[PDB]
Structure formats: C-alpha cells, structure tokens
Amino acid sequence: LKPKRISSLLDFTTYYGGAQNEQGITVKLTDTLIEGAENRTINVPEPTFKSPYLMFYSLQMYFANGGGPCYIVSTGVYDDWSDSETPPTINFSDLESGLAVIRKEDEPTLLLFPDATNLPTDDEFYSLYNSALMQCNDLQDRFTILDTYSDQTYNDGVEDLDPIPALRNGINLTKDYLKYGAAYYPFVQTILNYQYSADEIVIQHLSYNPNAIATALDNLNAVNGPTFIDAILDDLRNSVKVANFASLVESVLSTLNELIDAKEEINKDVNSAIASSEEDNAIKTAISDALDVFNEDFEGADKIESVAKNLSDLLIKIKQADTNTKVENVLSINALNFSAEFEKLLTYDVNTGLTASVTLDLFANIGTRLDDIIAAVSAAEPIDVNNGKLNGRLLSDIEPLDNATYNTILLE
Amino acid sequence: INSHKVTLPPSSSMAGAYARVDNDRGVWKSPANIGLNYVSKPSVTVSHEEQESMNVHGTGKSVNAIRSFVGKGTLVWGARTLAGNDNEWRYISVRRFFN
Amino acid sequence: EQESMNVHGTGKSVNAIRSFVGKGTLVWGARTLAGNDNEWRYISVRRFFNMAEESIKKATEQFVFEPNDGNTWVRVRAMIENFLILQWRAGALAGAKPEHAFYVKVGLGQTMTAQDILEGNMNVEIGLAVVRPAEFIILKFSHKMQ
Amino acid sequence: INSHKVTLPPSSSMAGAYARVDNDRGVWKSPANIGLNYVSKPSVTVSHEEQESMNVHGTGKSVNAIRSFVGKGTLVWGARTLAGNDNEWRYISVRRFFNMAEESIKKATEQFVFEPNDGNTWVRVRAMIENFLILQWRAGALAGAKPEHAFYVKVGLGQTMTAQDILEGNMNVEIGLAVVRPAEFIILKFSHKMQ
Amino acid sequence: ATYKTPGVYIEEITKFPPSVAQVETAIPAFIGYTQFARTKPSVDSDDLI
C-alpha cells in the first residue's frame, strides 16, 4: 500500500510483473472421412470464465494512447483459481483502502479503478465512485473518470436493468460533487491477446484410427529396458580435498537427475491413457491406482526429489566455505545436513567394499511397479474406440511430436 | 454467506450528513435534498400521498421521510423538528443556528 | 439515441464513443455530470480552474505572516495579474483586450474593512472569462435579391 | 554512543529567532513562517486539524505550533500571545513594539520634570514625540498614506489639562497609534465573468 | 467560512443561473391486444402482458 511513480511499461513489469494466465481455454481435435477424403477440424471457443484482473491490460492501453508518468497503488496480489470454472473474487474493502492512501499524495490529478467492473454487486460499484467524488470535493484539485457497470442489460438478482439509467440512480449527490466527474459509454474491443501458458493446455483428440493406448505402450515398453532404467540403478549402488570431493558429489547428483527426468516422461504416458479410457471405469481405476503406487518413493514415501535439491545447495556452500574455516568444512559434512542426506538411499552400505546390509533402500522397487503398469494399461486397449494420438497431452509437449499441428493451434 | 446484508436504523447516517453539510454550506442550511452513501434502498416504500400526514399534522409532530426518485436515487426529503407547527422553531437549521 | 445521453432532465450527461464512415472510431462528447450548469458543464473549463487555482495558491504561501498593508497589496495584485496575462495570450481567456478577460481586486475599502485587518484577514477577488467549445454549428441559408 | 541525541524544550531556540528577525526586518515583524537551525524534527506530529483548537479557543489562551511541511522543513507556525481574543493585544509583534516605543519616550522625558509647565514647554514636548513617530511611519511600522492617519499627539491647557491640574503640578500627554497587523489568513475568491 | 489555522484558502462563488432542458412533445402510447407479447421471441412465455 505504498504509492510509487513510474515512467513506462518497462518500469511497471520490473516492480509489479504482468497479467495472470487464463485457466478457461479448451482445444478440440476431430478427424473425419468425407467420401474417402480426410478432414481435420480444430475448435477453440471463446472462454466464458475469465480472470477478473485488468490492470496490466489497462496500462497497455494508456501508454499506446499517449500517456506519460503515473502513480501505481497496489491493493494486494493475485489469488489462485480453485478450479477451471471458478475465478477469484474482488473485494470492496481492498479498493477503498487504496483510496485512503492516495489522499495523502499531492501530485496526481486523476483517479481510476481498473478492476471495479468485476465487483460482486452493482451497489458496491456505485458506492466506490461516490467516495471518489467526495475526495475530489475536499481536496478540490482532482478529477474522476467513470464507466458503467456493464455494456449490456444485466441482472440485479430481482430485476433486469439498463446500464445508462442504472448509473443515474446509483450516483446520488448534488452538483457541488457531480462537477468533478465524467462518464463514458460503451466498452471497447482491442487488438491485445490474452496471457496464457502452454504448460496448462490439455488437448482432447477424437480420431477414426485409435492408437492412444498403443502409443502409450510403445513409450513405456521402451523405457522398461536394461540400457534405459537398469543402467541408472547399478551406478547408484585442504583445498585439494574439497575439490576432489566435489567431483564425487557431482557424479551422484547427475545420476539422480536422469532418474527424475525418467519419472517425468512416465507420467505423461499414463495420463494420456487415463483420459482415453473413459469407457469401463473399473479399468481407469486400476490404471490410476498403479500410477500413485509408482509415485510413492519419488514424492510421498521417501524424499527422492527433495534430496536432489538440498545436495545442490550444500555443494555450493562447501566451495565458498574454504575461504576461512576448516571447521565449517567439518560441521557440515559430519555433524550437520550432509552426512544425514546420504543415508536415505543407502543407510549402512559402508559395511563392506560393496553396498551390503541393505536396511533402507529407496530404489529397486521401480521395475516391480513398472511392469504392473504395463499389464494394467494392457486391459485398456480393447475398450478405447475413439481417441487418437494427442488425447490428454499438454500443448507444450506436442511441439517436438507434430510441429505443424502445434503452430495451427496457436493461431486459433 | 456474504449475500445477506445488514439493515440499520437511519440515525447514524443522518449524523454524518449533518457534519458534511455544515462544513460545505454552513449550519443555517437545511439538511434535506441530499443523498446517503452505502445505502441501496429504503426498507419501506413511502409514496407522495402518505408523506402528507407525515410532514403536516394536527399534533405538530412531524416525521421526516427517506424516499426514492427516478433518476435521482435515495434522498432525505424533510427538514422539520417535532414542534412542526411553531412559527419560530419548526425548522432544524433555525434551531441549530440559535444553539 | 445519443440525444438523451447528451442532454437530459437530470443533467447527468454520458459521453458516447461512436463510429463514422470515412473517419473511424471517435470520442463524441465532452460534458461533466453537471451537464445543465452554465458554469461547470464542460470538462475543459473545470480542469482549467483546477490548474489555475492550485498554481496561485502555492505562490501565495510566501505572504502568510507578512504586513497586511498597502505595500503588500500592490505586489500581490501584480503577481496574479502577470500570470493571467500569459493565459490570455495563449488563448485560454477570450477578449480583445486584457480588461475584458479578467479582473483582480484587493485592498482596504475594496475587499476589506478595518475590523478585518485587526482579525488578520486579507481578501483577494478574481474573476475569469474562459473560452467555451463550439458544440453545435447552425448554418442558415437564404435568398437575396439580384 | 554518539548516535543518541538531545531533546530540548523550544524556548531558547525561539529567543535566538526573535533576535534574528528584529535585526533583519524590525520589531514590528511577526516571528512566524521562519525556520530553526540545528533541529532535525519536532518530537510530536501536529496535523492541520488539531492546530485549530491550539490557535483559536474559547478561553483565548493560544499555543503556537512547530510543524513540518513537505518541501519546506520544520517551521514556526503561529504568532499569538496568551490574550488571543483581544483586538489590541493578540499579536506578539504589536505588544513588543509598544514595549519599545513607550520606554524610549519615557527616558527622553526625564529632562522635563521640574521645568516650567507653560506654553513654551508644551510646544517642544509635542515636537520631540512627533519627530520620533515620523521615523517609525517611514520605516513601515505605522500604517497610513499620510502622517495624520498614523498617529496624533495632544498636550496643553484646554486640551488635556485644567487650571486646577497646573496648581497640583500635573502635565498630561496623550498619544494614539495605528500599528501594522500581520496577514494571518489569505482568502482567494474565484468567480466567472461574462464574455 | 470559518478559518482557525493559518494559511491560504480557496472559495468559489456561484453567479450564473442554470439552464432549462426541453422535453419531447409527441410520444404516444398504444393500448390494446397483441398476438403474443414476449421478451424472448424463441421462448414461449407471455411475460409482457
């Protein structure tokens, strides 16, 4: 709640950032045959659920029409969407709190509220603009720019109201207040695009040739090999001393990362098979149950993805600690976190030259949980009749697969 | 839960409007033909015909009405005291200027 | 349907954004929400008064505890008059000569009494003639004899 | 140790500012709208709204406020005495000019104590006081377009004295002054004029 | 109109009269029977009776 004077759009994104990614976009693909000729249909409807935040878009319109220096008064940060059809809400008590701090500033001459048309009731909308005109009367050096609540006929809960006569009812002050404001109508259509992320767009693909489960099988059969996933597992089982010891940790940390990258590509294959087998809900439950039991040791059971992060920051710390103290290089590797983090993959492997006395082992449950998934999605291939190659895939992940389809979806 | 609103008696909104008009125009200006903030509607509708026995009465005990008008919103429409047939003391602004 | 937007019995005017063939999308309306007021119906008149009053008010705080006599009243009048002469020459004030455009009055026997001096009051009076826009242009055609 | 500073009551800084303004502009100039040296801030913040009952009050006992303004620093903002509803004595500079003028005239008058109380003395007493007040009018302490608007001096038999007063040994001199007041409130009145 | 703290103040004085706004003169009203009287022409409900 501190007013700050900026000068351009590049100054705004430095201190405040950009817009919120939209969550209401859907993409549909359909393959058809018309007398022996192929036909592909791409359908992206306009979203009915939008983000209620409009501040970054309004500053783009201001600088494009000749604006100069202005003041920014934040009222809070963005809230998250609960799901794909419930956007967050705008509170009346935050916007009125922002009007109280701008009363103490001397230099601005114009008052605006860019998020105000997405307020829950129209009575809150008119009451906010009645407060701005009372501030313009008291300080007697400012002016207010108003809009209507909507550009079309809107529902009040009891009645339907036209926008122009409803604004004339809501603003109920005398002339000594009305001379400080002006109102404009209707809304304007711009050249700007919505802000979105390609990591959150899911494709639904209906094709006459169904190979969704077969393409999901070929990736998962290939990763279940001796050179692929078995080669990851058998590898795991003064100033010159610190520099040699950092080379040993970098080889272990490089082995963990390709195991985590193998975990990422498995989940994209099973998710496309879960979404394709909407028929026979008992088979979808078995495929979903096999996936979370494989994801136990990676996230839920043991801290496999958590030790790969702390070892990297512990690796940087030991290279800076060599400037002053050897006890610093002793307190970490024996007493504090560094001796404790190695125990979770192998607890007492130091009993011999080879890893023995396997009290704790986060590995070697991978291949048992993998071939369970291979049989579980094997029941799904005679029950899927309509879903094609890209069903259930993220939009960013199809760019290496089919580049021409990815560019066509971006235009729509 | 937030769709339910509070209904209040109007005496504390009137006190705020007394201080707003005295600062703008003085204490000798009647506090009527003015608007109220944070108010959606009156709770009861009062027409033209039933305000007549509110404003002028044989006892002299006048009651000021809060009303709605098309194109103007909710307003205070009445500026009398409870000695409403007195030629010296029937207006609120005369009594408060003497005070 | 812009007629009841621009001129109305309540005086609450709404400015319209419209399209015209050969011209594109334009702003067509320049009124405030006190649209039947002869002093305050135009946006540009109100915003010029906001500029001129604040600039004069900031320049006046150097005179607050000064002697309230004839030497001060001559210099206060000339400071305000020099500022308004520049506004007349730039075209903000209408007039063929400067005394048609404004006036400034301050002094004992003009704006103040002797009882006002003992209380510590100094009164300055300023009147302005600001240029208005040409909103309706009416062409009147007629025949003349040969 | 040196990061801790001293807080003082403001009366000795005000005495230095009284002597600075009297040397620069005279004793008839109000000691307000001025700055204080060696001062970082006031100890308490006083706003616009709470100085109103400090400056003007029903008892008449006014208190002068030290305030801060953006772009201007810490200033003295108030120039009243504790008789703040008096039309003769509410300003500090009026009271201190009367203290100067009365003492200077009183010391110059002791050369006349056992002199003859006749018309030759009354002419020279009147001209001594009139020559002094003409210099005060020209320096700006007395308001007036001409000298008889600014002061008057009266002394003589049939003007200030009776014949019974002469036998008792009394001589009466009457002096009236018109001292310049400060401009405490400045009110700008704006209006439209016809084209 | 009352000033207690020292400084500069701004007052506006009202001199010009307001102006009258002219009303429409010929807007008729027709009162009688219709065929259906619907707000939404596709949905079959006479809510404009």
Numbering used by the authors:
A (entry chain 3A): 51 to 287, 321 to 495
B (entry chain 5B): 496 to 594
C (entry chain 3A): 545 to 690
D (entry chain 4A): 496 to 690
E (entry chain 4B): 2 to 50
Task: Kindly provide excerpts from the paper associated with this entry.
CISs are macromolecular injection devices with an overall structure that is homologous to the contractile tails of bacteriophages. Their conserved modules include an inner tube, a contractile sheath and a baseplate complex. For firing of the extended apparatus, the baseplate undergoes a conformational change and triggers sheath contraction, which in turn causes the inner tube to be expelled and injected into a target. Here we performed structural and mechanistic studies on a clade Ib CIS gene cluster in the marine bacterium Algoriphagus machipongonensis PR1.
Typical CIS-like particles were found in both extended and contracted states. To explore the mechanism of AlgoCIS firing, we determined post-firing structures of both sheath and baseplate.
